Amino acid sequence: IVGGKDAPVGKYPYQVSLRLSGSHRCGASILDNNNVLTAAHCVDGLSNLNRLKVHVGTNYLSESGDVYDVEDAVVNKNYDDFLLRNDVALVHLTNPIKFNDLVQPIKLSTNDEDLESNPCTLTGWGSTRLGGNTPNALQEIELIVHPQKQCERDQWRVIDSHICTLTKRGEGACHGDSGGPLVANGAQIGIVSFGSPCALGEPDVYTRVSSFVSWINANLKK
Amino acid sequence: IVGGKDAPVGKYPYQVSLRLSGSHRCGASILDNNNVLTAAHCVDGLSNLNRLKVHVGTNYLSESGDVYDVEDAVVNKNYDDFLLRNDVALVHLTNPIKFNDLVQPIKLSTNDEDLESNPCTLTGWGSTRLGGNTPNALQEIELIVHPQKQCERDQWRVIDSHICTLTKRGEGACHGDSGGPLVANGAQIGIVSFGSPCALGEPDVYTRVSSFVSWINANLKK
């Protein structure tokens, strides 16, 4: 995240850090005891999931927090890496997450009314500048949902299953934030997917959660 | 291409337009009678290559030019779409291309000395503005090779098998240019791979051809 600030400890208990062989790869969110939500882009190309771990309960990359193992990853069958569509995936855990004050699930948006031009929150460990290193401390930032009609004109091949944000140059998502949660009114409305490599004044694009609620419920771990 | 100009007819005989079901998808270049060079990103996600056609001998998308059928596509086994590495692929043609004044192959760079800070040429049918429609006429633009040492600091995870370009905001590659040829001194030195969605003052990144000459020769059609 570019232009954000260090998040208070425990303020975002639903935040997940997906780490590959110990290194942060993408953000994700806790849906329930056995399921974590992320972007397909983050797990589609992985050959060995035994090296992918789910880290929760911590604001720092230097800390392990509570670590959970991945049983499998379910990628939306319609995910298109070229057109950047249906960028959504579920990570199933081998053992259930133990909730506490620092680890809690987040509700999914099932109603996107009145979201446009209103505030929303983004969190993540992505770079704080293009070509920059990942910050150790979780970052937070308040953005604005960019009207769909405008985003369709501003970005490349944006469709109804996308949602966008935009404030100004100097504020936005960056490498490492992908898969992370965009929230508003206590519900996750988007999954960080793509944009124009870090806060250059162009909208950031997210997978619209409400468009995949059905798919998510159908693929939740048994 | 943003900030370019209409290319003269026949000036770039090695330019290819890869079209999927009749619509431009990516650029590419002619290596010889049976092989076309492009980015792995352009063909990795395709399942039915019978829908993909190679178009040469024309500067316009509204024209068909000479059309060739695809027998197979060979993607570098080390292609990583998350880290954006080894973005290179070969498209094998079922029948040989007939060369003429409008259709000719291009030489591959096997020596990248003195390229940095010097001019190079990029051609393609990519958008002329982020979120814009593809131009009908092939566009051309003269760029400058951005020093590797600087590009490594400016972009995300740039490595030795990448080459970069950069001039200023308002000039650069855009959606639809991927897979296209970056040339200098009559040799292709790069394959359009990624960047920060259209000429925003950040370097555009290409697959460095010289780094894959061996791989290319080893996978050329028999």
Short mmCIF file of C-alpha atoms in Angstrom, two decimals:
data_model
loop_
_atom_site.label_atom_id
_atom_site.label_comp_id
_atom_site.label_asym_id
_atom_site.label_seq_id
_atom_site.Cartn_x
_atom_site.Cartn_y
_atom_site.Cartn_z
CA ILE A 1 0.00 0.00 0.00
CA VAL A 2 1.30 3.41 -1.06
CA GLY A 3 0.37 6.40 1.08
CA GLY A 4 -1.04 4.43 3.98
CA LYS A 5 -0.09 4.19 7.65
CA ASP A 6 0.95 1.53 10.16
CA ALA A 7 -2.16 -0.31 11.31
CA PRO A 8 -2.85 -0.63 15.06
CA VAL A 9 -2.15 -4.08 16.51
CA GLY A 10 -5.26 -6.27 16.35
CA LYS A 11 -7.39 -3.76 14.44
CA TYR A 12 -7.79 -6.11 11.47
CA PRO A 13 -8.15 -9.64 12.92
CA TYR A 14 -9.42 -11.04 9.60
CA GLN A 15 -6.20 -10.17 7.77
CA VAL A 16 -4.12 -13.06 6.46
CA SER A 17 -0.57 -13.19 5.14
CA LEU A 18 -0.04 -16.04 2.67
CA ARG A 19 3.64 -16.95 2.83
CA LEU A 20 5.53 -19.22 0.44
CA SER A 21 8.55 -20.87 2.05
CA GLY A 22 8.48 -18.19 4.73
CA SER A 23 8.12 -15.13 2.47
CA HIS A 24 4.99 -12.99 2.08
CA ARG A 25 3.35 -13.58 -1.30
CA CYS A 26 -0.20 -12.22 -1.00
CA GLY A 27 -2.87 -11.03 1.35
CA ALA A 28 -6.06 -12.97 2.06
CA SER A 29 -8.97 -12.95 4.51
CA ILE A 30 -10.54 -15.37 6.99
CA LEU A 31 -14.03 -16.58 6.03
CA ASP A 32 -14.44 -19.24 8.73
CA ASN A 33 -12.47 -21.91 10.62
CA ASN A 34 -11.40 -23.82 7.50
CA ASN A 35 -11.52 -21.30 4.66
CA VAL A 36 -9.41 -18.34 3.58
CA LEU A 37 -10.36 -16.09 0.64
CA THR A 38 -7.76 -14.77 -1.82
CA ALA A 39 -7.05 -14.03 -5.49
CA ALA A 40 -6.63 -16.88 -7.97
CA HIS A 41 -3.57 -15.05 -9.27
CA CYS A 42 -1.90 -15.79 -5.94
CA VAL A 43 -2.24 -19.58 -5.99
CA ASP A 44 -3.01 -20.70 -9.54
CA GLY A 45 0.63 -21.29 -10.47
CA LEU A 46 1.71 -23.14 -7.32
CA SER A 47 2.85 -26.75 -7.76
CA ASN A 48 3.47 -27.64 -4.10
CA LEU A 49 1.04 -26.23 -1.55
CA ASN A 50 2.99 -27.76 1.32
CA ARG A 51 5.22 -24.70 1.09
CA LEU A 52 2.29 -22.26 1.30
CA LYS A 53 1.29 -21.29 4.84
CA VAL A 54 -1.54 -19.19 6.27
CA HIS A 55 -0.39 -16.66 8.87
CA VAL A 56 -2.87 -14.89 11.14
CA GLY A 57 -2.92 -13.05 14.46
CA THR A 58 0.00 -10.74 13.67
CA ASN A 59 0.67 -7.32 12.14
CA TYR A 60 4.29 -8.10 11.33
CA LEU A 61 6.04 -10.16 8.67
CA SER A 62 8.92 -10.67 11.10
CA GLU A 63 6.50 -12.59 13.34
CA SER A 64 4.90 -15.97 12.68
CA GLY A 65 1.62 -15.35 14.50
CA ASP A 66 -0.63 -18.42 14.33
CA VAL A 67 0.30 -20.65 11.38
CA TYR A 68 -2.07 -22.97 9.55
CA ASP A 69 -1.40 -25.52 6.83
CA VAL A 70 -3.00 -25.65 3.41
CA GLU A 71 -4.90 -28.78 2.41
CA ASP A 72 -5.89 -27.53 -1.04
CA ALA A 73 -6.64 -24.43 -3.10
CA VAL A 74 -9.75 -24.11 -5.23
CA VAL A 75 -9.44 -21.73 -8.18
CA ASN A 76 -12.52 -20.46 -10.01
CA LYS A 77 -12.73 -22.52 -13.20
CA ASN A 78 -13.43 -19.35 -15.19
CA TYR A 79 -10.32 -17.50 -14.02
CA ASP A 80 -8.66 -15.82 -17.00
CA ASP A 81 -5.09 -14.64 -16.39
CA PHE A 82 -5.02 -12.66 -19.63
CA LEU A 83 -8.34 -10.82 -19.41
CA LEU A 84 -8.01 -10.59 -15.63
CA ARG A 85 -11.49 -11.94 -14.87
CA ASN A 86 -12.90 -14.12 -12.10
CA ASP A 87 -9.76 -13.63 -10.00
CA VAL A 88 -10.96 -15.51 -6.92
CA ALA A 89 -9.83 -18.59 -5.02
CA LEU A 90 -10.39 -20.41 -1.75
CA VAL A 91 -7.65 -21.92 0.39
CA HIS A 92 -8.82 -24.89 2.46
CA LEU A 93 -7.04 -25.48 5.77
CA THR A 94 -6.05 -28.91 7.09
CA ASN A 95 -6.85 -27.94 10.69
CA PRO A 96 -9.41 -25.35 11.93
CA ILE A 97 -8.39 -21.82 12.90
CA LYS A 98 -8.75 -20.99 16.60
CA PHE A 99 -10.49 -17.61 16.85
CA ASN A 100 -9.59 -15.04 19.51
CA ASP A 101 -9.25 -11.28 19.93
CA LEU A 102 -6.55 -11.19 17.23
CA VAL A 103 -8.07 -13.74 14.86
CA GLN A 104 -11.63 -13.37 13.56
CA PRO A 105 -13.54 -13.99 10.31
CA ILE A 106 -15.04 -11.26 8.12
CA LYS A 107 -18.54 -11.07 6.65
CA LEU A 108 -18.94 -11.08 2.86
CA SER A 109 -20.89 -8.33 1.12
CA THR A 110 -24.19 -9.59 -0.28
CA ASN A 111 -25.50 -6.09 -1.03
CA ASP A 112 -23.42 -3.43 -2.80
CA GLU A 113 -25.97 -0.60 -2.61
CA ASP A 114 -24.66 2.91 -1.89
CA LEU A 115 -21.01 1.86 -2.03
CA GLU A 116 -19.93 4.11 -4.89
CA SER A 117 -18.12 7.37 -4.09
CA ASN A 118 -18.13 6.35 -0.42
CA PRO A 119 -15.20 5.34 1.86
CA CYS A 120 -13.71 1.87 2.19
CA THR A 121 -10.65 0.37 3.86
CA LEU A 122 -7.74 -1.54 2.37
CA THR A 123 -5.04 -3.36 4.34
CA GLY A 124 -1.93 -5.28 3.36
CA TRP A 125 1.83 -5.77 3.38
CA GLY A 126 2.36 -4.70 -0.23
CA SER A 127 5.17 -2.34 -1.23
CA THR A 128 4.88 1.27 -0.08
CA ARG A 129 6.26 2.42 -3.44
CA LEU A 130 6.75 0.80 -6.86
CA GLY A 131 9.97 -1.20 -6.78
CA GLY A 132 10.09 -0.91 -3.01
CA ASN A 133 10.51 -3.55 -0.32
CA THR A 134 7.60 -4.96 1.64
CA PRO A 135 6.98 -3.14 4.94
CA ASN A 136 7.23 -5.21 8.10
CA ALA A 137 4.16 -3.56 9.63
CA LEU A 138 0.68 -4.09 8.20
CA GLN A 139 -0.50 -0.94 6.42
CA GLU A 140 -4.01 0.52 6.32
CA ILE A 141 -5.58 3.17 4.10
CA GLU A 142 -8.98 4.70 3.51
CA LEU A 143 -10.00 4.89 -0.14
CA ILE A 144 -13.13 5.75 -2.13
CA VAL A 145 -15.10 3.37 -4.33
CA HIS A 146 -14.76 4.62 -7.91
CA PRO A 147 -18.12 4.61 -9.77
CA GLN A 148 -18.41 1.53 -11.99
CA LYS A 149 -19.52 3.58 -15.00
CA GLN A 150 -16.34 5.65 -14.71
CA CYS A 151 -14.06 2.72 -13.97
CA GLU A 152 -15.29 1.00 -17.13
CA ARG A 153 -14.03 3.98 -19.12
CA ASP A 154 -10.82 4.41 -17.10
CA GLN A 155 -9.41 0.87 -16.93
CA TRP A 156 -8.95 -2.07 -19.28
CA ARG A 157 -11.81 -4.53 -19.78
CA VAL A 158 -13.58 -3.87 -16.48
CA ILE A 159 -16.82 -5.84 -16.11
CA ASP A 160 -19.66 -6.12 -13.59
CA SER A 161 -17.80 -8.64 -11.42
CA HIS A 162 -15.12 -6.01 -10.70
CA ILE A 163 -15.20 -3.12 -8.23
CA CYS A 164 -12.79 -0.18 -8.23
CA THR A 165 -11.20 2.42 -5.96
CA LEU A 166 -9.50 5.72 -6.62
CA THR A 167 -8.47 8.79 -4.67
CA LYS A 168 -5.35 10.39 -6.16
CA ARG A 169 -1.75 9.76 -7.18
CA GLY A 170 0.25 8.71 -4.13
CA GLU A 171 -2.43 6.46 -2.65
CA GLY A 172 -3.24 2.92 -3.73
CA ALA A 173 -2.50 -0.79 -3.74
CA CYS A 174 0.88 -2.21 -4.74
CA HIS A 175 2.72 -5.52 -5.26
CA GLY A 176 2.11 -7.80 -2.31
CA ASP A 177 -1.40 -6.46 -1.62
CA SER A 178 -3.04 -8.74 -4.17
CA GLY A 179 -5.58 -11.14 -2.69
CA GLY A 180 -6.15 -8.78 0.22
CA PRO A 181 -9.49 -7.50 1.58
CA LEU A 182 -11.21 -4.23 0.64
CA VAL A 183 -13.86 -3.57 3.28
CA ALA A 184 -16.75 -1.20 3.95
CA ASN A 185 -19.42 -1.20 6.66
CA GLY A 186 -17.79 -4.25 8.25
CA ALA A 187 -18.07 -6.44 5.16
CA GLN A 188 -15.54 -7.42 2.51
CA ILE A 189 -16.58 -5.93 -0.83
CA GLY A 190 -13.49 -6.68 -2.89
CA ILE A 191 -10.34 -8.77 -3.36
CA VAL A 192 -7.24 -6.88 -4.58
CA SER A 193 -6.63 -8.03 -8.16
CA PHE A 194 -4.87 -5.56 -10.48
CA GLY A 195 -4.19 -1.95 -11.36
CA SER A 196 -1.52 0.31 -12.81
CA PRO A 197 1.53 -0.59 -10.69
CA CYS A 198 1.13 1.60 -7.64
CA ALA A 199 -0.74 4.80 -7.02
CA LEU A 200 -0.18 6.66 -10.27
CA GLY A 201 -3.65 8.20 -10.32
CA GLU A 202 -5.42 5.35 -12.11
CA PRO A 203 -8.05 3.18 -10.40
CA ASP A 204 -7.14 -0.05 -8.62
CA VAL A 205 -9.34 -3.01 -9.61
CA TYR A 206 -10.73 -5.67 -7.30
CA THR A 207 -12.78 -8.81 -7.69
CA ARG A 208 -16.30 -7.86 -6.54
CA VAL A 209 -17.14 -10.22 -3.68
CA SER A 210 -20.94 -10.02 -4.05
CA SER A 211 -20.65 -11.46 -7.57
CA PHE A 212 -19.08 -14.67 -6.24
CA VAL A 213 -20.93 -15.32 -2.98
CA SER A 214 -22.69 -18.31 -4.56
CA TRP A 215 -19.46 -19.76 -5.95
CA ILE A 216 -17.76 -19.26 -2.58
CA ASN A 217 -20.50 -21.01 -0.62
CA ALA A 218 -20.48 -23.90 -3.09
CA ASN A 219 -16.75 -24.46 -2.69
CA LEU A 220 -16.35 -24.01 1.07
CA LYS A 221 -14.59 -26.90 2.79
CA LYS A 222 -16.93 -29.67 3.94
CA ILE B 1 1.16 2.24 -28.00
CA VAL B 2 0.59 5.62 -26.37
CA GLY B 3 2.12 8.69 -28.02
CA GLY B 4 3.16 6.93 -31.22
CA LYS B 5 2.28 7.53 -34.87
CA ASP B 6 0.76 5.61 -37.77
CA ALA B 7 3.43 3.34 -39.24
CA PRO B 8 4.08 3.52 -43.01
CA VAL B 9 2.71 0.58 -45.00
CA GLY B 10 5.29 -2.20 -45.27
CA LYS B 11 7.87 -0.55 -43.00
CA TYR B 12 7.70 -3.39 -40.46
CA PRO B 13 7.35 -6.64 -42.47
CA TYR B 14 8.23 -8.80 -39.45
CA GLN B 15 5.21 -7.59 -37.44
CA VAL B 16 2.55 -10.16 -36.61
CA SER B 17 -0.97 -9.77 -35.25
CA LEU B 18 -2.14 -12.81 -33.28
CA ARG B 19 -5.93 -12.87 -33.52
CA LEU B 20 -8.31 -15.03 -31.50
CA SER B 21 -11.57 -15.72 -33.33
CA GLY B 22 -10.92 -12.70 -35.51
CA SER B 23 -9.93 -10.21 -32.81
CA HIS B 24 -6.42 -8.89 -32.13
CA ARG B 25 -5.00 -10.35 -28.91
CA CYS B 26 -1.24 -9.77 -29.03
CA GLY B 27 1.67 -8.77 -31.20
CA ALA B 28 4.40 -11.18 -32.29
CA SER B 29 7.28 -11.39 -34.76
CA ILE B 30 8.37 -13.64 -37.63
CA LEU B 31 11.50 -15.71 -36.93
CA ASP B 32 11.37 -17.90 -40.04
CA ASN B 33 8.93 -19.75 -42.31
CA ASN B 34 7.40 -21.86 -39.53
CA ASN B 35 7.98 -19.94 -36.31
CA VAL B 36 6.53 -16.81 -34.73
CA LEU B 37 7.89 -15.33 -31.48
CA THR B 38 5.59 -13.92 -28.79
CA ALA B 39 4.98 -13.68 -25.04
CA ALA B 40 3.94 -16.74 -23.05
CA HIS B 41 1.30 -14.53 -21.41
CA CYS B 42 -0.44 -14.37 -24.79
CA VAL B 43 -0.91 -18.09 -25.37
CA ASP B 44 -0.44 -19.92 -22.08
CA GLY B 45 -4.10 -19.73 -21.10
CA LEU B 46 -5.47 -20.89 -24.46
CA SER B 47 -6.95 -24.37 -24.92
CA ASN B 48 -8.21 -24.40 -28.52
CA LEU B 49 -5.44 -23.15 -30.82
CA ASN B 50 -7.73 -23.66 -33.81
CA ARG B 51 -9.21 -20.27 -32.86
CA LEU B 52 -5.82 -18.53 -32.96
CA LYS B 53 -4.53 -17.22 -36.29
CA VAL B 54 -1.28 -15.56 -37.38
CA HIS B 55 -1.80 -12.45 -39.51
CA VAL B 56 1.03 -10.89 -41.50
CA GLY B 57 1.51 -8.58 -44.47
CA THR B 58 -0.83 -5.86 -43.22
CA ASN B 59 -0.80 -2.67 -41.15
CA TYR B 60 -4.53 -2.78 -40.42
CA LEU B 61 -6.72 -4.83 -38.11
CA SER B 62 -9.60 -4.30 -40.54
CA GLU B 63 -7.61 -6.27 -43.12
CA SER B 64 -6.73 -9.97 -43.03
CA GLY B 65 -3.39 -9.82 -44.84
CA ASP B 66 -1.84 -13.28 -45.19
CA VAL B 67 -3.30 -15.71 -42.65
CA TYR B 68 -1.54 -18.76 -41.26
CA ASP B 69 -2.82 -21.53 -39.03
CA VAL B 70 -1.30 -22.55 -35.71
CA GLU B 71 -0.11 -26.14 -35.25
CA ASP B 72 1.07 -25.70 -31.66
CA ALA B 73 2.41 -23.22 -29.13
CA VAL B 74 5.49 -23.90 -27.01
CA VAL B 75 5.63 -22.04 -23.70
CA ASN B 76 8.88 -21.78 -21.74
CA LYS B 77 8.58 -24.33 -18.92
CA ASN B 78 9.89 -21.75 -16.45
CA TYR B 79 7.28 -19.11 -17.27
CA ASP B 80 5.93 -17.65 -14.02
CA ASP B 81 2.90 -15.39 -14.44
CA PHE B 82 3.03 -14.20 -10.84
CA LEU B 83 6.66 -13.09 -10.76
CA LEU B 84 6.47 -12.23 -14.47
CA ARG B 85 9.57 -14.17 -15.53
CA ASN B 86 10.56 -16.10 -18.65
CA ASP B 87 7.62 -14.60 -20.56
CA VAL B 88 8.46 -16.16 -23.93
CA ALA B 89 6.77 -18.59 -26.29
CA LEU B 90 6.93 -19.87 -29.85
CA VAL B 91 3.99 -20.42 -32.16
CA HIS B 92 4.53 -23.19 -34.71
CA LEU B 93 2.74 -22.81 -38.04
CA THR B 94 1.08 -25.69 -39.89
CA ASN B 95 2.17 -24.34 -43.27
CA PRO B 96 5.24 -22.20 -44.14
CA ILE B 97 5.00 -18.43 -44.49
CA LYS B 98 5.59 -17.08 -47.99
CA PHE B 99 8.01 -14.15 -47.72
CA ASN B 100 7.73 -11.04 -49.89
CA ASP B 101 8.20 -7.28 -49.67
CA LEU B 102 5.53 -7.07 -46.95
CA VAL B 103 6.43 -10.25 -45.07
CA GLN B 104 9.96 -10.85 -43.78
CA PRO B 105 11.63 -12.39 -40.72
CA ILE B 106 13.64 -10.45 -38.14
CA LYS B 107 17.06 -11.25 -36.70
CA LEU B 108 17.38 -11.95 -32.98
CA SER B 109 19.83 -10.02 -30.81
CA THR B 110 22.71 -12.18 -29.63
CA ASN B 111 24.75 -9.23 -28.36
CA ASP B 112 23.27 -6.50 -26.16
CA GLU B 113 26.35 -4.28 -25.92
CA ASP B 114 25.85 -0.50 -26.09
CA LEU B 115 22.07 -0.77 -26.06
CA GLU B 116 21.42 1.15 -22.85
CA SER B 117 20.53 4.84 -23.10
CA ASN B 118 20.23 4.42 -26.86
CA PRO B 119 17.18 4.47 -29.21
CA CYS B 120 14.99 1.49 -30.07
CA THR B 121 11.71 1.00 -31.92
CA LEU B 122 8.42 -0.49 -30.72
CA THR B 123 5.45 -1.37 -32.93
CA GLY B 124 1.99 -2.70 -32.19
CA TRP B 125 -1.78 -2.36 -32.26
CA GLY B 126 -2.15 -1.81 -28.53
CA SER B 127 -4.44 0.88 -27.12
CA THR B 128 -3.33 4.48 -27.63
CA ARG B 129 -4.50 5.32 -24.10
CA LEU B 130 -5.31 3.26 -21.00
CA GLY B 131 -8.85 1.95 -21.33
CA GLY B 132 -8.95 2.97 -24.97
CA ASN B 133 -9.88 1.00 -28.09
CA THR B 134 -7.30 -0.64 -30.32
CA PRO B 135 -6.23 1.54 -33.27
CA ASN B 136 -6.84 0.14 -36.74
CA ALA B 137 -3.46 1.29 -38.02
CA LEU B 138 -0.21 -0.23 -36.75
CA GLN B 139 1.58 2.28 -34.50
CA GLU B 140 5.30 2.94 -34.22
CA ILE B 141 7.34 4.79 -31.60
CA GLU B 142 10.99 5.45 -30.85
CA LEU B 143 11.98 4.79 -27.25
CA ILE B 144 15.17 4.65 -25.18
CA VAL B 145 16.57 1.58 -23.44
CA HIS B 146 16.44 2.26 -19.69
CA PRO B 147 19.68 1.25 -17.90
CA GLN B 148 19.23 -2.14 -16.24
CA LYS B 149 20.71 -0.90 -12.96
CA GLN B 150 18.04 1.81 -12.83
CA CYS B 151 15.21 -0.42 -14.01
CA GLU B 152 15.98 -2.86 -11.21
CA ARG B 153 15.28 -0.03 -8.76
CA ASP B 154 12.25 1.39 -10.60
CA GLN B 155 10.18 -1.75 -11.27
CA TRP B 156 9.10 -4.86 -9.37
CA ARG B 157 11.40 -7.90 -9.43
CA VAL B 158 13.27 -7.07 -12.63
CA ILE B 159 16.04 -9.58 -13.37
CA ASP B 160 18.81 -10.06 -15.94
CA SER B 161 16.49 -11.72 -18.47
CA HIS B 162 14.45 -8.51 -18.70
CA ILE B 163 15.21 -5.34 -20.64
CA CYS B 164 13.46 -1.98 -20.14
CA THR B 165 12.52 1.22 -21.92
CA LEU B 166 11.52 4.66 -20.68
CA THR B 167 11.16 8.16 -22.07
CA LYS B 168 8.35 10.11 -20.42
CA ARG B 169 4.70 10.18 -19.40
CA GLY B 170 2.57 9.93 -22.52
CA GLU B 171 4.85 7.50 -24.35
CA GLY B 172 4.88 3.74 -23.91
CA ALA B 173 3.36 0.32 -24.49
CA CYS B 174 -0.27 -0.49 -23.69
CA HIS B 175 -2.76 -3.36 -23.69
CA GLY B 176 -2.59 -5.24 -26.98
CA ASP B 177 1.12 -4.55 -27.51
CA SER B 178 2.21 -7.52 -25.40
CA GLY B 179 4.20 -10.13 -27.30
CA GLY B 180 5.31 -7.48 -29.76
CA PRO B 181 8.86 -6.72 -30.94
CA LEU B 182 11.23 -4.10 -29.52
CA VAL B 183 14.01 -3.59 -32.06
CA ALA B 184 17.34 -1.80 -32.38
CA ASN B 185 20.01 -1.92 -35.10
CA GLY B 186 17.80 -4.24 -37.14
CA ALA B 187 17.56 -6.93 -34.46
CA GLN B 188 14.82 -7.76 -31.98
CA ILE B 189 16.09 -7.13 -28.46
CA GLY B 190 12.86 -7.50 -26.51
CA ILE B 191 9.34 -8.95 -26.31
CA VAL B 192 6.69 -6.68 -24.72
CA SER B 193 5.81 -8.27 -21.38
CA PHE B 194 4.57 -5.88 -18.70
CA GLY B 195 4.65 -2.40 -17.23
CA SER B 196 2.49 0.10 -15.36
CA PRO B 197 -0.66 0.21 -17.53
CA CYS B 198 0.23 2.73 -20.20
CA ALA B 199 2.76 5.52 -20.30
CA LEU B 200 2.56 6.91 -16.78
CA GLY B 201 6.27 7.67 -16.52
CA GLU B 202 7.37 4.26 -15.26
CA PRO B 203 9.52 1.90 -17.36
CA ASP B 204 7.99 -0.74 -19.63
CA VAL B 205 9.49 -4.21 -19.17
CA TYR B 206 10.32 -6.69 -21.92
CA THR B 207 11.63 -10.22 -22.09
CA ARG B 208 15.29 -9.86 -23.11
CA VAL B 209 15.66 -11.85 -26.34
CA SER B 210 19.41 -12.50 -26.01
CA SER B 211 18.75 -14.41 -22.79
CA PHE B 212 16.57 -16.96 -24.60
CA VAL B 213 18.30 -17.44 -27.95
CA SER B 214 19.37 -20.95 -26.93
CA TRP B 215 15.87 -21.87 -25.75
CA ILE B 216 14.38 -20.47 -28.94
CA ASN B 217 16.73 -22.42 -31.23
CA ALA B 218 16.06 -25.61 -29.28
CA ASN B 219 12.29 -25.31 -29.70
CA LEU B 220 12.08 -24.15 -33.31
CA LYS B 221 9.78 -26.29 -35.46
CA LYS B 222 11.49 -29.28 -37.08
#
